[PDB]
Amino acid sequence: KRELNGYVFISEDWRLPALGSSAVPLTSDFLNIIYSIDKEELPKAVELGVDSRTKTVKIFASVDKLLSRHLAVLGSTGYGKSNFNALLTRKVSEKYPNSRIV
Amino acid sequence: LFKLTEISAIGYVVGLEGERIRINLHEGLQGRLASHRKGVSSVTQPGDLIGFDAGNILVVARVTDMAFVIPLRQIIAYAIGFVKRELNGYVFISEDWRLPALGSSAVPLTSDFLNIIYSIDKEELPKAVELGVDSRTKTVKIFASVDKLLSRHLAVLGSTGYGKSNFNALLTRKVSEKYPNSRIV
Amino acid sequence: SIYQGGNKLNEDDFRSHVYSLCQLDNVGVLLGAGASVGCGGKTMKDVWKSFKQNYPELLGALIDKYLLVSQIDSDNNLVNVELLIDEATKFLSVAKTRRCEDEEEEFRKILSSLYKEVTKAALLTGEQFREKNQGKKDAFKYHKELISKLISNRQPGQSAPAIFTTNYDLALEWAAEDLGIQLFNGFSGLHTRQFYPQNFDLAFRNVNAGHYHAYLYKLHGSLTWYQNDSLTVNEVSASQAYDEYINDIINKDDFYRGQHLIYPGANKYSHTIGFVYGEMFRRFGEFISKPQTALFINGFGFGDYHINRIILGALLNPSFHVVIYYPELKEAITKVSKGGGSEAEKAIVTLKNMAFNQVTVVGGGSKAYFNSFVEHLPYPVLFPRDNIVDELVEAIANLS
Amino acid sequence: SIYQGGNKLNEDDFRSHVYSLCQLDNVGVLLGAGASVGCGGKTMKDVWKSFKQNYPELLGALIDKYLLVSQIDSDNNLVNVELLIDEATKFLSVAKTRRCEDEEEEFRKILSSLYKEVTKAALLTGEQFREKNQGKKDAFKYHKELISKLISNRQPGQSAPAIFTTNYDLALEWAAEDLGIQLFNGFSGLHTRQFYPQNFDLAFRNVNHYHAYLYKLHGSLTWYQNDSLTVNEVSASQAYDEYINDIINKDDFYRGQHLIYPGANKYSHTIGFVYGEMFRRFGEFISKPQTALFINGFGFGDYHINRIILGALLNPSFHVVIYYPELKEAITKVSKGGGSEAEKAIVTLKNMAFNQVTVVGGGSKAYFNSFVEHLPYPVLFPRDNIVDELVEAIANLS
Amino acid sequence: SLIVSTQRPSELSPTVLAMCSNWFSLRLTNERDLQALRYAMESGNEQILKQISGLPRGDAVAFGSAFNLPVRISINQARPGPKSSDAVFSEEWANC
Ligand SMILES: Nc1ncnc2c1ncn2[C@@H]1O[C@H](COP(=O)(O)OP(=O)(O)OC[C@H]2O[C@H](O)[C@H](O)[C@@H]2O)[C@@H](O)[C@H]1O
Ligand SMILES: Nc1ncnc2c1ncn2[C@@H]1O[C@H](COP(=O)(O)OP(=O)(O)OC[C@H]2O[C@H](O)[C@H](O)[C@@H]2O)[C@@H](O)[C@H]1O
Ligand SMILES: Nc1ncnc2c1ncn2[C@@H]1O[C@H](COP(=O)(O)OP(=O)(O)O)[C@@H](O)[C@H]1O
Ligand SMILES: Nc1ncnc2c1ncn2[C@@H]1O[C@H](COP(=O)(O)OP(=O)(O)O)[C@@H](O)[C@H]1O
Ligand SMILES: [Mg+2]
Ligand SMILES: [Mg+2]
């Protein structure tokens, strides 16, 4: 729906369309709205990658909601755990130069 | 000069297959909204409630299916009880073994009949506390009796960060201001 | 005091029983002359008092010469008024046929006084009888409620309610013309109204998809029925009847025509008049011989042998139910227990003593009146119990 | 400001209610003279105010000698103009049929002055009433938005919007001819255009959202009756050359059964037919179930329209929304004692305990330029105009 | 009288849960945490259990002896509320 001059995405799943309604494909503009954050955590957001299916929408995450409780990284051997750990640690150290990491 | 009903119709019953009911809609209705004296109501989406006029009682049903069959439209519903008038008010009963007859009309449920369904006995009003509102329409208020809640044991379940503590705080605070000579630990 | 098979039950059980009887295949109501006393009517024993107070000279010649009425019945006010007019008419016809000139005037003088008394007690409005919109007054408030309750609790694919009555006043017609319902009484036309016995098997329907009609059987006639110079039966309006023959009956003192009126059960010996009376009784008998019938009786005095015989014979069917109102049960029970009272009391007590679950009797004086009878019937849920049209009508009238 | 059912409402609930009403089976709009002042029009008060100033010699005769207008309403500026014109036309016809030469010349001047005054205020662009593409200008920005919103909110299989009006100017046709929509007004043909009442039962269909209806209850500037007993319609550029340039810049009035505005010549059985048809079609519309109506710019001074509106509330499925800026003045003047018929009529329907009646008032929150924004846009409706940027390049190519 | 609040209904004694008269339930997304709720209550209702898997924040489903029929409620906010939260890393890391 619309809020002031743009759009927002709500995540409730009990509303259904009506009979006779037409179906349209989703343009890349609405995919950016669906996979966004709440318009205020951008100053404390970190980029991690791009979506896999289309490779056109960037993905961000909030440090406060990410490094609040424990975090888990799992996977088999030869698939890229160390890459992820190094990237996250380095680009967290860069943003907050007064942090403690062991 | 005779007015048997002050509400408009939506469809009519065309078949019964046990405990499920089948309804065909009129030609004009396309916009999923029906208007009456008190306002506008939605009658097509699944999960809504509709009613039938069967003599001197009103049957209540819940919508499940909706599909084509200018093409016609069809609805399948299931009954959950009936509403009765006894002296000067109304009462709701929760037995669903009564069904309407062929040719009966289907009508929407206004906000006054919705109050009767989600209501308690009148003599227990001073012994009641307020919790919230109806989720689907956000018009009716919900009450419950304290003597029937905190008589046996009560359970509250949920995941993290969804509102267990808020509900606990509200429920515990509302009781103390009502029964000051009570013990809570 | 409520009895069902010789045992007592409370008010709540009686109301529950009444609720279950209103959802059967057939529903009917039979009313008497006691149901019109709240609108301005009089009972059958209040007319004999007036007759014997206003005309004390004909009473002696009506007992000592022609033996048309007993002294015991007259002294206790237990005379069947409608059973005397037919005999008087027969006497007058015989005297006219055999040319006994001195005997014609005497019987023309007593009929003129009997009609003058019976007619004045059935107007219900005095001289406001030729006007219009008589149903808007407060006297006919419960007739409308009864009619509305009977119609508004029938499911589709079911029969229409039937009403039988022993009155000959215009109360029910006035009540029905205000709600907008149409009643079938066997007549059709506007400029020449005629009686057709085959129009009792008709009903309305909608050409697009209403079911607002009922049947009214009048067993003793009406004020507005008369036989013209030809051999046919016609019906007119209240104003036309008042301007034609009612005003002279009430006011003039030497007016009597002959075999003209069709009330009450007067000219049965003519074969074009009794044909009207026979059909109503035949169709009453046909109605209560149906598998799932329920009948309500109120206002009746149980002084008719034929109706009692018909009702008694119809109870040997395991799916017939009757409810009776009689606000004098105790005064009849004592009199029957000691020595035995009148025939009506004996009949009602014998019917009460039956050990069936089909017969129910209610007494208690003012607790078994016509007004109390209505509230025992159920009230529909969707009926609008508010006032929205009147305000808009008044606002429209206020404009300009 | 906002009253529903006798009690008050806030902005958000009112906006939600407005959105819910547009999704019913039938949607209609009634517009008055107040909806044309944003593009160059005038209100009925101003017309009388200017006539009284410009022609003081003729004012005394209408009050003293002929008794057509009273003094209190003339001093208060609460006169009705179309009724006056109809009565003057009837007077002139009666005077002509009995050969009274003195009275015949007296009413020609009156009618000429009245027609000059009313016509000069109906032209919304002055001398540019002849040229084409008049709807491309900025004054008609909201007339386009109203039609676009009122068309785009209909699902397939539903009806088309209906537009009633009491004006006799060419604003809506000019607005519609620029978007690319077609309006049914009851006429057909080009070289000889005639009035057919059955043209309102037709619709368009594609053999491989196009049309709307327009009802004018007081006529139009481009309608006239010739010697033939049929009504004709022509274009603005032809009316200007035929009979409009003489009304303003000349003292010309010699045909008494020619013009069909405003509500004049009702004594002829050929002209009253159009008015009767329009009024009957208006009446038959609001008797349908599931109907919603909006009123804006119409002062409640007509008896018959008020009677028609009130009687339709007896049906459970009829709803209406009314806009009236000067509400507090009426409330105080009827509570204190006094007031004209319009104030009493609006107040009596404001106090009713009905949920089918809603009244919105204010000082500038109840104008026509604010009524449009209360109506929403669909989510997928296109708004960015990127087609004129290409037409300009095509023209630059030369 | 007892009020029990837990987020893992499966890690409880079945008797304790089966001896209650009323139940309030918020969002619950786990296949083994729904079997316990199904077992605790009596049979005869299955269309009400599908909603729990997708209830939004602040909504709950209530069914028991003090309610005539199951209802989906939107709960009011308490004022004043309980303690807000724990420490926030960003504020302390940017206090140079
Ligand atoms: N306000 C009242 N409400 C109800 N019942 C009343 C009331 N007042 C009196 N009653 C009762 O109303 C009754 C009065 O009955 P009557 O009018 O004399 O008798 P009928 O109308 O059957 O006479 C006509 C028939 O009888 C002939 O034999 C012919 O065959 C006719 O067919 C008593 O029970 C009163 O207690
Ligand atoms: N910008 C504006 N926006 C909206 N409303 C406005 C505006 N300016 C003024 N108004 C209001 O617009 C209204 C102006 O009322 P008038 O033009 O005299 O009335 P009518 O158009 O019905 O007159 C024609 C009718 O008269 C006969 O009765 C027949 O029925 C005719 O059809 C006032 O409320 C102003 O406050
Ligand atoms: N996102 C990525 N893009 C490109 N190469 C990757 C990515 N993730 C992992 N790799 C490749 O995986 C190889 C080793 O992965 P490694 O960090 O050893 O995984 P693990 O620690 O799970 O064995 C590297 O040579 C690197 O090129
Ligand atoms: N019904 C509600 N309405 C509004 N806010 C709520 C509601 N329930 C929870 N919240 C918000 O959620 C936050 C914390 O939720 P909380 O109840 O602590 O989750 P948990 O159930 O895991 O304890 C609070 O700050 C409160 O503002
Ligand atoms: Mg590694
Ligand atoms: Mg918590």
Q: Around Cβ A13, how many Cβ atoms within 10 Å?
A: 11
Chain E's closest residue to B144, CA to CA, is: E66
Task: With beta carbons less than 8 A apart as the criterion, state whether B113 and B41 touch.
Answer: no
Q: Do C400 and D314 touch (CB under 8 A)?
A: no
Measured distance CA(A44)–CA(A36) in Å, rounded: 14
Q: Around Cβ C189, how many Cβ atoms within 10 Å?
A: 10
Q: What is the DSSP letter of C158?
A: -
E80 burial (CB, 10 Å; 0-12 / 13-18 / 19+) is: exposed
Measured distance CA(C93)–CA(C113) in Å, rounded: 18
Backbone phi and psi for residue D16, each to the nearest 5 degrees, phi listed first? -65, -40
Task: With beta carbons less than 8 A apart as the criterion, state whether B37 and B6 touch.
Answer: yes
Q: How far is CA C18 from CA C295, C316, C323, C376, D320, in A?
A: 11, 21, 9, 7, 45
Measured distance CA(C119)–CA(C209) in Å, rounded: 46
Kindly state the tokens that stand for C357: 């679950």
Alpha helices, H only, D33-128 = 44-54, 57-64, 72-76, 81-97, 101-120
Task: With beta carbons less than 8 A apart as the criterion, state whether B74 and B44 touch.
Answer: no
Ligand 1 atom with the shortest distance to the CA of C37: 1
Of B87, B27, B23, B15, nearest to B52 by C-alpha is B23
Q: Are strands C293-298 and C320-325 parallel, antiparallel or unpaired?
A: parallel
Which residues lie closer than 8 Å to D142 by C-beta, 6 or more apart?
Answer: D38, D368, D369, D372
Task: With beta carbons less than 8 A apart as the criterion, state whether E17 and E40 touch.
Answer: yes
Task: Find how far residue D5's CA is from the centre of its chain.
Answer: 29
Which residues lie closer than 8 Å to C131 by C-beta, 6 or more apart?
Answer: none
Q: How far is the CA of B132 from the centre of ligand 4 (A)?
A: 15
Which residues lie closer than 8 Å to B21 by C-beta, 6 or more apart?
Answer: B13, B15, B61, B76, B77, B78, B79, B99, B100
Kindly state the tokens that stand for C137: 């007054």
Q: How many helices (H) and strands (E) does chain E have?
A: 3, 4
Kindly state the tokens that stand for D10: 């806030």
Q: How far is CA C285 from CA C171, C183, C222, C279, in A?
A: 25, 20, 21, 10
Task: With beta carbons less than 8 A apart as the criterion, state whether C121 and C47 touch.
Answer: yes
Mapping DSSP onto H, E and C, the string for D152-211 reads HCCCCCCCCCEEEECCCCCHHHHHHHHHCCEEECCEECCCCCEECHHHHHCCCCCCCCCE
Long-range contacts of C2-10 (CB under 8 A, 24+ apart): C2/C360, C2/C361, C2/C362, C3/C352, C3/C360, C3/C361, C4/C357, C4/C359, C4/C360, C5/C354, C5/C355, C5/C356, C5/C357, C5/C359, C6/C352, C6/C353, C6/C354, C6/C355
Q: Could you tell me if the CB of D44 is within 6 A of ligand 2?
A: yes
Which residues on D lie below 8 Å from C400 (Cβ)?
303
Q: How far is CA A93 from CA A61, A86, C359, in A?
A: 15, 11, 96
- The H or E element containing residue D11 is helix D11-21
Task: With beta carbons less than 8 A apart as the criterion, state whether D347 and D121 touch.
Answer: no
Kindly state the tokens that stand for D54: 């410009």
Measured distance CA(A48)–CA(A33) in Å, rounded: 17
Buried b (16+ CB within 10 A) or exposed e, B152-181: eebbbbbbeebbbebbebbbeeebeeeeee
Q: Around Cβ E86, how many Cβ atoms within 10 Å?
A: 7
Kindly state the tokens that stand for D224: 């006239």
Concatenated DSSP letters for D111-132? HHHHHHHHHHTT-SSGGGGSSS
Q: How far is the CA of C34 from the centre of ligand 3 (A)?
A: 104
Which residues lie closer than 8 Å to C89 by C-beta, 6 or more apart?
Answer: C111, C259, C266, C267, C269
Q: Do E73 and B132 touch (CB under 8 A)?
A: yes
Measured distance CA(D42)–CA(B17) in Å, rounded: 67
Which residues lie closer than 8 Å to C390 by C-beta, 6 or more apart?
Answer: none
Which residues is D8 bridged to in the sheet?
D3
Measured distance CA(C132)–CA(C134) in Å, rounded: 6
Backbone phi and psi for residue D92, each to the nearest 5 degrees, phi listed first? -65, -40
Question: Atom 2 (ligand 4): residue with closest C-alpha?
Answer: E58
Q: Do D156 and A20 touch (CB under 8 A)?
A: yes
Of C143, C101, C105, C117, nearest to C54 by C-alpha is C117
Measured distance CA(D20)–CA(D13) in Å, rounded: 11
Backbone phi and psi for residue C310, each to the nearest 5 degrees, phi listed first? -65, -45
Task: With beta carbons less than 8 A apart as the criterion, state whether D43 and D346 touch.
Answer: no
Experimental technique used to determine this entry: cryo-EM
Of C212, C209, C213, C210, nearest to C199 by C-alpha is C213
- The residue numbers preceding gaps of C to N over 2.5 A in chain E are none
Kindly state the tokens that stand for D149: 């919103």
Three-state DSSP class for residue D357: strand
Which residues lie closer than 8 Å to D110 by C-beta, 6 or more apart?
Answer: D58, D62, D88
How many angstroms separate the first and last alpha carbons of chain C?
A: 58
Kindly state the tokens that stand for B65: 């299916």
| Interface check C393 vs B, CB under 8 A | no
Task: With beta carbons less than 8 A apart as the criterion, state whether D345 and D304 touch.
Answer: no
Which residues lie closer than 8 Å to D3 by C-beta, 6 or more apart?
Answer: D9, D350, D358, D359, D360
Measured distance CA(B42)–CA(B39) in Å, rounded: 11
| Interface check B160 vs C, CB under 8 A | no
Q: How far is CA A1 from CA A7, A30, A34, D17, in A?
A: 6, 11, 11, 18
Q: Where are the beta strands (DSSP E) in C211-333?
A: 213-218, 225-227, 233-235, 293-298, 320-325
Measured distance CA(C44)–CA(C264) in Å, rounded: 13
Q: How far is CA D134 from CA B139, D221, E58, in A?
A: 50, 16, 56
What type of residue is D183? L
Of D161, D142, D141, D143, nearest to D152 by C-alpha is D161
Establish whether chain D is in contact with chain A, requiring a minimum of 3 CB pairs below 8 angstroms: yes
Longest dimension (CA), chain D: 71
Task: Find how far residue C264's CA is from the centre of its chain.
Answer: 11
Task: With beta carbons less than 8 A apart as the criterion, state whether D124 and D39 touch.
Answer: yes
Which residues is C324 bridged to in the sheet?
C297, C361
Measured distance CA(E6)–CA(E12) in Å, rounded: 9
| Interface check B103 vs C, CB under 8 A | yes
C42 burial (CB, 10 Å; 0-12 / 13-18 / 19+) is: middle
Which residues is B68 bridged to in the sheet?
B73
Q: Do C155 and B1 touch (CB under 8 A)?
A: no
- The H or E element containing residue D303 is helix D303-311
Report C:162-201 residues touching D (Cβ under 8 A): none
Which residues on A lie below 8 Å from E86 (Cβ)?
68
Kindly state the tokens that stand for B55: 């003599």
Q: Are strands D357-360 and E3-6 parallel, antiparallel or unpaired?
A: unpaired
Measured distance CA(C71)–CA(B124) in Å, rounded: 68
Which residues lie closer than 8 Å to C33 by C-beta, 6 or more apart?
Answer: C41, C43, C44, C166, C167, C299, C301
For the sheet containing D291-296, what is the strand order?
D7-8, D2-4, D357-360, D318-323, D291-296, D26-31, D162-165, D211-216, D182-184
Kindly state the tokens that stand for C36: 């019109």
Q: What is the dihedral of CA C83, C84, C89, C95, to 10 degrees?
A: 130
Which residue's entry shows tokens 């105080």?
D332
Q: How far is CA D365 from CA D5, D10, D42, D368, D373, in A?
A: 20, 13, 20, 9, 11
What count of residues does chain A have? 102
